[PDB]
């Protein structure tokens, strides 16, 4: 992607932010026009901006383009839980196609921190006939969107088949991923108890299961 | 009612009409009929002759309706001399029994025949019957008009006379004969017995005596 | 041609305006016969054109737009009736489902069209001039 | 971003409404023949072209059955009739009693029927009014109802068909029913909206629309059951029907290849001029002059079982049922079990059983060449109609002298459902056309009336020079 | 305010050609473009082309001007302004960097500036390109568990376990049961199979009157598997 | 092909039962249709009634109630019988073999069309008389030559005097003798009787004893006389 965004950028709640996005002349806004989309991950992207300054159809007057001769700037005043997600642009003319740019991760700072929720799941009696044993460590509502996973066998870490998800945002505008371990029945008969840990940034959560119970 | 006449000139083409003409579509037939023997159809479908009819005969289609079904017969011969019907059948009239009208045919222009006439007086075991008849007979004379007188010497009989029409023979021509009755003392009394035949103008006299 | 620019945008179709109201009323003048009651319904239905015609020629009359066919006012636009921008209207939308549109309301257009301008020009023109 | 309200007079919008066309055919010149009902004195002469303009990004709604440029041509159909029927000669002398005796027919001896033609005497007026005159004519025996006895083939007393419901008014020798082209234009201020799809159903959207000044040749023929000299549909053989599950409603075939029928009267009539009044000279039939047939209709069998075929494949697309019977109609009113129509004066009444009497299956379950054993249709005649509907008053078609030969191209059929039994174990189909209009739905069904409105109320980032503004 | 519907996720060897379909309605199909987009994981959005139902135009970027075919379909009128088109794309030789999803978009404006503009996107379609062949999911039950003692608040859901390749979609019900429903995504196993779980808190009082079928189906494989969750917790949290 | 032969009565009684006989030759009776047609003197011939191959019988309607026609099967003939017969019944009686005829003039499942029949081959016809006279026998008197014109003929006759009814059949040498012969049409005396008379013109040279012996028959009276004829005497 010649045309080049900033990578991240972040407001505070209730504030606003300014995305850039530019490229070389013969990509860039001398004769071309941009518009905006946003653009979560495992979603379809929605028009915020097009042609440069108005905006799509049913668009809040919240954000806004202002387009130089060697860049295009998208501000989004008045912050909401919603805005935190990704957001691209595209440099186009009348007949040529988008010509899309890197993305930025827009950031809302100033929110309240939330509360992991952690459920540890067991292999159930049929997955022991297959013959698996997989361990299954659910986490959502947690904000921010980083956590550091571990597990543990009879209190000794485990790093044998293990396999973290990155997280994902709810449509609560919290964040939440899962973890696996994947093993064999012997490993799973051989301790006393198996624990998930999930460590955050302000509490450290663990949650056991014994493999015998 | 009767038959209705015609005359046609020897060798000549003859257009015998039919009467009540057809209401339709037709199927006629004609027939040729001498007096005394068996009739003969000449055309059985208008157009169509049956094998063993002469070509001089022809009827009129039907191809355009309209026309009048005319029995045409080219070269007129003596033999052509007879009566002619027309059984009409068409699609408006019904059931259709009853044969046309006759069309008695007659040839003019033929040669004249003198009459032939042979007198025969009464035999010999009639007047051993008590009974005498003087047979003139004629034949072979055209046309069909005769007259027969008998003479007593010089004197007109007038009396017990009897005379047949004249009839067509197989010649083509015609034949009559005339008988006299007389008992067998009135033949053997008077000196000679004549019969007279006019015809046209002539008069042919044949004269038979007693033994 | 009469009525090309039906399925068009509203921005090519206000280009020709002349020929829809060429044939709106336009009976040639011939230069170049009726009987009976059952030619009278043809004499019913000019007439009726003609009336057709000389009603918008009225409302045109009393909008301050007789002789022209495109014409500004001086009304402002009403938020409720359409929240559409410049290119939400002339290059996405027909006439035809645009005038559903307004339907609802037109008869208010109508009001303010004769009212807020000739009504207040028509008295600011005698306390002017 | 500040909007103004702005007046555009001439934009392409249009409403659905009903207003009066009018007429226009063709020129088309006859000096000595003149007074056509359908076309002199009720139409007029139009252009070389009526142009048609493609509406581009239109889909427009079409409805052949709740459309007025059929209930305006029935309407003016009627008027000109009635119009055709107001200066000629009138029979109300004619209800006088009628001596009638059979006409001479040929013994007979398969089954048909026969059209008695009876020949009927009667004292009637003459150009004196004390003075009478005893005239004789000859009557089918449709036009006549006894009084008496009838029962022999010899006299009775006899009775006009018409002489007590309505008075009847003879045709003018004049005029000609032959229909003739007739195009709809529309009025300043309207237009018409033609749908150029070739498979398209009765109603619904239209993609390919265009707009006319004037329709297309379209000739005013009336039948029953069959309906000819027509359009032909491209393509496919579409049906059309305003409701396919309505029992009762009929249902319009428009077929892909139009069949020859050939309807033809032998017998060479005459006509005999009786005077009943000053000027009144009433035609009347002369003595048949030859034979005496019935007239007839022949259709190509070959052609004619292909296309009950396909209309039967086409009846099986719409009706996942059971096996196509098709028959007859049930029975009852000549005028409604009879393809009825007109060739040059006189009216013909057609028995179609020997074309309706085929079934066709899904499963086929079950050929060759046979030459052109075109299919016969004995076919009667009237000459007192009151068809038309009760509006259209009596007529009495004056006899045509000569043989009569009309070709005609079948385009189409009127079907009718039969229902009351079981749902798809048996469908029946019956012909019959008991609706005058649906006769001229088939020729109206691509084209639509809508009214222009060219008022466009549109606002722009534009105001005008606001009353103060000059210098 | 239209609809465009892709079809299924579907997979592919390396080398073949697959064709996506993009079936439309709730507006009229030729007044505007039909744009196909694809997003990798690596290098992010890409447009690939558009094409004109009206007008048969066709725009594709130099990358897959060599690979892609893209057609439409005459649309089917459903009333006076709406109807109904199908869009087609199809690309030929396909390649692991291939994989991805891939969107079709509907234009924003019928003349203007930004005519074929990108406005009404589609729900997605996940091509994949592998060698390894099609492997069914195994599903099994994930008991309740306590989420609130004194809210009387369970969790309880279903484990897809083993499945290639992505993705699977779980309904509740028969899509009658979606309030309260949270789906993970999938983890990439050492194997390189897929395996996501489906969680639903409800309340602990419904378990007589209120069914717990965990709809399952994995389409590529052709597979649907329906699980009835089994009801019986040991978390002695819930029973207080 | 076909030959037929009449053969009947010749003089049947008023009020009652004429029957007349018709022979077969050629074909059989099955094959074709079969007419009977009578003409009487001072009138034309009339159609009486046609009988056909499946013994189906149609009749005139002026004798419909008084003409019955038949066929016979083992033996090739047709009977004609006519029941209360009049004076106005006496007529010269013929049998026909008649064709059928199809006239198609218009569309044959109409119908259009109507049958005519046409009668191709007659046969001679038998003379047949009613009235309430009796019989009568001729007598037969022979007419010596005159031995008549100049030299190189003459002729010499048979005299069939008085005799009922019509007709006699005269020959000479039961048919020897053949060329020359003539006989002339019988008269109608004033008694009710009919007279004829036969002639034969053969040369004089040949009347030395050649003997010219004409025979005469008339069925009605069952008499079959000869007679001999010699020159002259006395
Ligand atoms: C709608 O469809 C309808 C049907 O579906 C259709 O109806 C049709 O109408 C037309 C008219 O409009 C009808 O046509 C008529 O047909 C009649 C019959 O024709 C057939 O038969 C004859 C006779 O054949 C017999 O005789 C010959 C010769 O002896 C034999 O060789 C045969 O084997 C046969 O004999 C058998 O049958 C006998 C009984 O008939 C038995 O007794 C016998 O033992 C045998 O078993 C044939 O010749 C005809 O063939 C001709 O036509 C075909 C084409 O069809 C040609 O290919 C062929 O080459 C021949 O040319 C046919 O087979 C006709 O008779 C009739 O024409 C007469 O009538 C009209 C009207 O009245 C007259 O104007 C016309 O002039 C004809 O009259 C002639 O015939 C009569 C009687 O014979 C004569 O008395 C008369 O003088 C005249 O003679 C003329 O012809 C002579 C030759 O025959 C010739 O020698 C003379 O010199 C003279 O020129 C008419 O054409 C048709 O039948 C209807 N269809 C049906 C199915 O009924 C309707 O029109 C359609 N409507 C439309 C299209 O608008
Ligand atoms: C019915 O509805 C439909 C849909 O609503 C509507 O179709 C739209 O029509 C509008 C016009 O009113 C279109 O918008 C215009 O598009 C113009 C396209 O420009 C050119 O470039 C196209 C792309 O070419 C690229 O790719 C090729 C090959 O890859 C390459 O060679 C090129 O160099 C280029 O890279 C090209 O497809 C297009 O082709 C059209 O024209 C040629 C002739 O030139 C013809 O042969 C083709 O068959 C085809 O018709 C064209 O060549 C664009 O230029 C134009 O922009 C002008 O106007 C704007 C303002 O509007 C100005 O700002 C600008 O400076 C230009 O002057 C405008 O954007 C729209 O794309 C259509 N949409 C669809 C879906 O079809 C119909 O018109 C409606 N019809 C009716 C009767 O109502
Ligand atoms: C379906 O479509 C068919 C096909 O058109 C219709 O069939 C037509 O029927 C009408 C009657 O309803 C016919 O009109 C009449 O025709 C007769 C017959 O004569 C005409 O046709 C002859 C060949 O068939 C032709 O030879 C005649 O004259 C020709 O030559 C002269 C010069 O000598 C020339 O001047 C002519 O122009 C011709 O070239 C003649 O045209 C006719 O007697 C009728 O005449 C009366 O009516 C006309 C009305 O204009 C009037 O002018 C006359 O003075 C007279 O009063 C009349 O023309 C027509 O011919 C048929 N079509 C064809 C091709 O033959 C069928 O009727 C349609 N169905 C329905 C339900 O309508
Ligand atoms: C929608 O309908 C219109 C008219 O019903 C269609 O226009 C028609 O298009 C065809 C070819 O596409 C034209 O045929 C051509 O005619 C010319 C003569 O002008 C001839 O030289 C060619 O060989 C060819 O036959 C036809 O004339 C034309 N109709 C009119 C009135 O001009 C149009 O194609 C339809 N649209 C669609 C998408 O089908
Ligand atoms: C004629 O065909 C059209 C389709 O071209 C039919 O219209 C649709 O018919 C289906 C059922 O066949 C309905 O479900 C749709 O709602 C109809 N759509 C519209 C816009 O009407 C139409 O019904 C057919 N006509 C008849 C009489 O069946
Ligand atoms: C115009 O004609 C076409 C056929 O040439 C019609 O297209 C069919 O429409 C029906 C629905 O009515 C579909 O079921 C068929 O699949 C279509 N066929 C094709 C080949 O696309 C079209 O509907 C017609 N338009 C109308 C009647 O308005
Ligand atoms: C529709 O018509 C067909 C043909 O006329 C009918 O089939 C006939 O059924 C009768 C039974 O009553 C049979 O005797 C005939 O042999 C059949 N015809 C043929 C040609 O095989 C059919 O029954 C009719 N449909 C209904 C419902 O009566
Ligand atoms: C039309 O003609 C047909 C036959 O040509 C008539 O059908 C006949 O009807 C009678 C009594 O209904 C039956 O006895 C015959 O068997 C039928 N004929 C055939 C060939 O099936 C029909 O009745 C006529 N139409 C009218 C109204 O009378
Ligand atoms: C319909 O057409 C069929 C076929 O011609 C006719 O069926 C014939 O009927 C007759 C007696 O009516 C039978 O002897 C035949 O065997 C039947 N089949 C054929 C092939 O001839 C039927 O009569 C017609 N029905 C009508 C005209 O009403
Ligand atoms: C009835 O149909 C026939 C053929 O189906 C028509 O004859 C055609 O006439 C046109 C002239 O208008 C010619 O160009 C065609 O070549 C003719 N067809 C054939 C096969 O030769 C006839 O005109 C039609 N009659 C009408 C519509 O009244
Ligand atoms: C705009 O329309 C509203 C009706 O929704 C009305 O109350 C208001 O007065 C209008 N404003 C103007 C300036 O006409
Ligand atoms: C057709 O008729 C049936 C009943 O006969 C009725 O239920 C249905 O609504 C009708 N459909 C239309 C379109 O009129
Ligand atoms: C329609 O017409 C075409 C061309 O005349 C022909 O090939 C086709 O068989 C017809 N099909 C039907 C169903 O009539
Ligand atoms: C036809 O109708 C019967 C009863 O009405 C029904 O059982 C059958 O399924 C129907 N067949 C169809 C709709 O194909
Ligand atoms: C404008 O176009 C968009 C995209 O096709 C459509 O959703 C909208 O309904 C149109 N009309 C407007 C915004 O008034």
Same mark, same amino acid.
């Given at each position: ?96 196609? *988008? ?96 624990? *998930? ?17 | ?211 | ?129 | ?48 072209? &009526? #142009? ?19 209930? #305006? ?13 107001? &200066? ?44 009478? #005159? ?44 032959? &229909? ?32 006319? #000044? ?114 007859? &109609? ?11 129509? /007109? ?80 749902? /798809? ?47 | ?240 | ?234």
């Amino acid at each position: 992607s010649v045309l080049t965004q900033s990578a991240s950028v972040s407001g505070s709640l209730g504030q606003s932010v300014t995305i850039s996005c530019t490229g070389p002349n013969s990509v860039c806004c001398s004769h071309k026009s941009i518009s905006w989309y946003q653009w979560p991950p495992g979603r379809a992207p929605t028009l915020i901006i097009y042609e440069d300054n108005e905006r799509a159809p049913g668009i809040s007057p919240r954000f806004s383009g202002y387009k130089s001769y060697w860049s295009a700037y998208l501000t989004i005043s008045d912050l909401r839980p919603e805005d935190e997600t990704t957001y691209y642009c595209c440099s186009y003319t009348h007949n040529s196609g *988008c010509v899309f740019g890197t993305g930025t991760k827009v950031s809302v700072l100033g929110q309240s921190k939330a509360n992991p929720s952690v459920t540890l799941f067991p292999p159930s009696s049929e997955e022991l006939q297959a013959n698996k044993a997989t361990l299954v460590c659910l986490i959502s509502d947690f904000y921010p969107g980083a956590v550091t996973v571990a597990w543990k066998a009879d209190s000794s870490p485990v790093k044998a088949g293990v396999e973290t998800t990155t997280p994902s945002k709810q449509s609560n505008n919290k964040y939440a991923a899962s973890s696996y371990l994947s093993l064999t029945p012997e490993q799973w008969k051989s301790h006393r108890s198996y624990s *998930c840990q999930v460590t955050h940034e302000g509490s450290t959560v663990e949650k056991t299961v014994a493999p015998t119970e | 009612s009767y038959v209705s006449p015609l005359s046609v000139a020897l060798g000549e083409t003859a257009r015998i009409s039919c009467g009540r003409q057809a209401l339709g579509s037709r199927a006629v037939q004609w027939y040729q009929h001498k007096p005394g023997q068996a009739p003969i159809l000449l055309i059985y479908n208008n157009q169509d002759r049956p094998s063993g009819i002469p070509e001089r005969f022809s009827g009129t289609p039907d191809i355009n309706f309209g026309t009048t079904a005319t029995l045409t017969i080219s070269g007129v011969e003596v033999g052509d001399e007879a009566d002619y019907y027309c059984h009409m059948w068409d699609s408006r009239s019904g059931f259709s029994w009853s044969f046309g009208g006759a069309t008695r045919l007659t040839v003019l222009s033929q040669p004249k025949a003198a009459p032939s006439v042979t007198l025969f007086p009464p035999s010999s075991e009639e007047l051993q019957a008590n009974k005498a008849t003087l047979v003139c007979l004629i034949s072979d004379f055209y046309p069909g008009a005769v007259t027969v007188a008998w003479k007593a010497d010089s004197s007109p009989v007038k009396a017990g006379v009897e005379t047949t029409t004249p009839s067509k023979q197989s010649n083509n021509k015609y034949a009559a004969s005339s008988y006299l009755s007389l008992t067998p003392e009135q033949w053997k009394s008077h000196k000679s017995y004549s019969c007279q035949v006019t015809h046209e103008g002539s008069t042919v006299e044949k004269t038979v005596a007693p033994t | 041609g009469f009525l090309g620019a039906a399925g068009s945008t509203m921005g090519a179709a206000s280009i020709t305006l002349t020929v829809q109201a060429r044939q709106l009323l336009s009976g040639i003048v011939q230069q170049q016969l009726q009987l009976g009651v059952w030619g009278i319904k043809q004499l019913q239905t000019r007439v009726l054109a003609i009336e057709r015609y000389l009603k918008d020629q009225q409302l045109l009359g009393i909008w301050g737009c007789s002789g022209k066919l495109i014409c500004t006012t001086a009304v402002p636009w009403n938020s409720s009736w359409s929240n559409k921008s410049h290119d939400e209207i002339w290059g996405n939308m027909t006439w035809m489902q645009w005038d559903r549109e307004i339907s609802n309301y037109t008869n208010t257009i109508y009001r303010l069209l004769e009212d807020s301008q000739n009504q207040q020009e028509q008295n600011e023109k005698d306390l002017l001039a | 971003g500040n909007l103004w309200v702005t007046v555009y007079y001439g934009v392409p919008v249009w409403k659905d409404a009903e207003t009066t066309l009018f007429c226009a055919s063709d020129a088309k010149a006859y000096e000595k023949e003149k007074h056509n009902v359908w076309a002199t004195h009720a139409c007029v002469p139009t252009d070389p072209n &009526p #142009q048609e303009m493609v509406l581009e990004n239109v889909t427009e709604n079409f409805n052949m059955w709740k459309n007025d440029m059929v209930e #305006q041509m029935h309407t003016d159909v009627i008027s000109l009739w009635d119009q055709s029927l107001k &200066p000629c000669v009138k029979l109300t002398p004619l209800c006088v009693t009628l001596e009638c005796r059979q006409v001479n027919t040929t013994n007979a001896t398969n089954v048909t029927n026969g059209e008695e033609i009876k020949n009927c005497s009667f004292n009637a007026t003459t150009e004196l009014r004390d003075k009478k #005159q005893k005239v004789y004519a000859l009557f089918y025996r449709l036009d006549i109802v006894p009084l008496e006895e009838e029962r022999k083939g010899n006299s009775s007393k006899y009775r006009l068909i018409n002489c007590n419901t309505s008075a009847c008014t003879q045709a003018c020798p004049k005029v000609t029913f032959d &229909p003739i082209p007739i195009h709809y234009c529309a009025p300043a201020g309207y237009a018409i909206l033609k749908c150029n799809n070739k498979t398209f159903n009765g109603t619904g959207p239209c993609n390919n629309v265009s707009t006319v #000044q004037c329709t297309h040749g379209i000739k005013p023929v009336v039948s029953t059951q069959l309906l000819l000299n027509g359009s032909l549909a491209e393509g496919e053989i579409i049906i059309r029907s305003e409701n396919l599950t309505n029992n009762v409603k009929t249902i319009i075939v428009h077929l892909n290849e139009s069949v020859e029928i050939v309807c033809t009267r032998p017998n060479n009539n005459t006509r005999k001029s009786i005077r009943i009044g000053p000027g009144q000279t009433f035609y009347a039939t002369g003595d048949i002059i030859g034979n005496i047939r019935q007239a007839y209709c022949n259709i190509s069998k070959d052609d004619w079982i292909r296309t009950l075929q396909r209309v039967g494949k086409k009846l099986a697309e719409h009706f996942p049922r059971r096996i196509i019977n098709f028959t007859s &109609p049930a029975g009852g009113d000549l005028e409604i079990t009879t393809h009825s129509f /007109n060739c040059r004066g006189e009216f013909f009444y057609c028995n179609t059983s020997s074309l309706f009497n085929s079934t066709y299956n899904p499963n086929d379950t079950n050929s060759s060449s046979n030459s052109s054993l075109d299919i016969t249709i004995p076919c009667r005649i009237k000459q007192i109609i009151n068809m038309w509907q009760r509006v259209g008053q009596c007529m009495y078609a004056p006899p045509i002298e000569g043989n009569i030969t009309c070709k005609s191209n079948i385009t189409g059929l009127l079907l009718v459902r039969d229902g009351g039994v079981e749902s /798809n174990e048996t469908e029946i189909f019956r012909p019959g056309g008991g609706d005058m209009r649906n006769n001229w739905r088939s020729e109206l069904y691509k084209y639509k009336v809508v009214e222009i409105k060219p008022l466009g109320i549109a606002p722009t980032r534009a105001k005008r020079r606001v009353v103060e503004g000059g210098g | 305010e239209g609809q465009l519907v892709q079809s299924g996720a579907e997979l592919k060897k390396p080398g073949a050609s697959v064709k996506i379909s993009c079936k439309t309605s709730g507006y009229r199909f030729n007044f505007y473009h039909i744009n196909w987009i694809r997003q990798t994981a690596g290098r992010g959005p890409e447009w690939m082309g558009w094409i004109s139902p009206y007008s048969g135009d066709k725009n594709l970027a130099p990358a897959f001007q060599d690979r892609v075919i893209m057609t439409t379909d005459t649309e089917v009128p459903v009333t006076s302004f709406t109807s109904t088109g199908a869009a087609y794309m199809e690309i030929r030789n396909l390649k692991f960097d291939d994989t991805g999803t891939y969107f079709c978009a509907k234009g924003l404006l019928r003349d203007g500036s930004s005519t074929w503009l990108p406005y009404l996107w589609g729900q997605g379609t996940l091509l994949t390109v592998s060698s390894a062949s099609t492997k069914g999911p195994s599903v099994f039950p994930l008991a309740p568990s306590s989420k609130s003692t004194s809210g009387g608040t369970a969790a309880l859901g279903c484990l897809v376990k083993d499945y290639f390749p992505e993705p699977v979609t779980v309904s509740w019900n028969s899509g009658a049961l979606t309030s309260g429903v949270h789906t993970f995504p999938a983890v990439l196993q050492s194997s390189g199979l897929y395996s996501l779980s489906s969680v639903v808190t409800v309340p602990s009082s419904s378990l007589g009157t209120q069914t717990y079928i965990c709809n399952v189906n994995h389409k590529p494989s052709n597979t649907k598997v329906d699980k009835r969750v089994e009801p019986k917790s040991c978390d002695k949290g819930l029973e207080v | 092909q076909v030959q037929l032969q009449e053969s009947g009565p010749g003089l049947v009684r008023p009020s009652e039962t004429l029957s007349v006989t018709c022979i077969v030759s050629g074909g059989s009776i099955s094959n074709y249709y079969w007419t009977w047609i009578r003409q009487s003197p001072g009138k034309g011939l009339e159609w009486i009634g046609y009988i056909s191959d499946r013994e189906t019988t149609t009749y005139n309607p002026s004798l419909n109630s008084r003409a019955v026609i038949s066929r016979d099967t083992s033996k090739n003939q047709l009977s004609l019988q006519l029941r209360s017969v009049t004076t106005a019944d006496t007529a010269i009686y013929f049998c026909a073999t008649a064709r059928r005829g199809q006239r198609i003039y218009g569309v044959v499942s109409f119908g259009e069309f109507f049958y005519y029949y046409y009668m191709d081959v007659w046969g001679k016809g038998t003379a047949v008389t009613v009235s309430s006279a009796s019989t009568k026998g001729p007598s037969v008197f022979p007419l010596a030559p005159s031995s008549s014109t100049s030299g190189g003929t003459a002729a010499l006759g048979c005299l069939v005097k008085d005799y009922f009814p019509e007709p006699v059949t005269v020959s000479w040498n039961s048919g020897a003798l053949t060329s020359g012969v003539h006989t002339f049409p019988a008269v109608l005396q004033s008694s009710g009787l009919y007279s004829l008379s036969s002639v034969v013109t053969v040369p004089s040279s040949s009347l030395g004893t050649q003997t010219y012996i004409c025979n005469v028959n008339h069925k009605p009276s069952n008499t079959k006389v000869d007679k001999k004829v010699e020159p002259k005497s006395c």
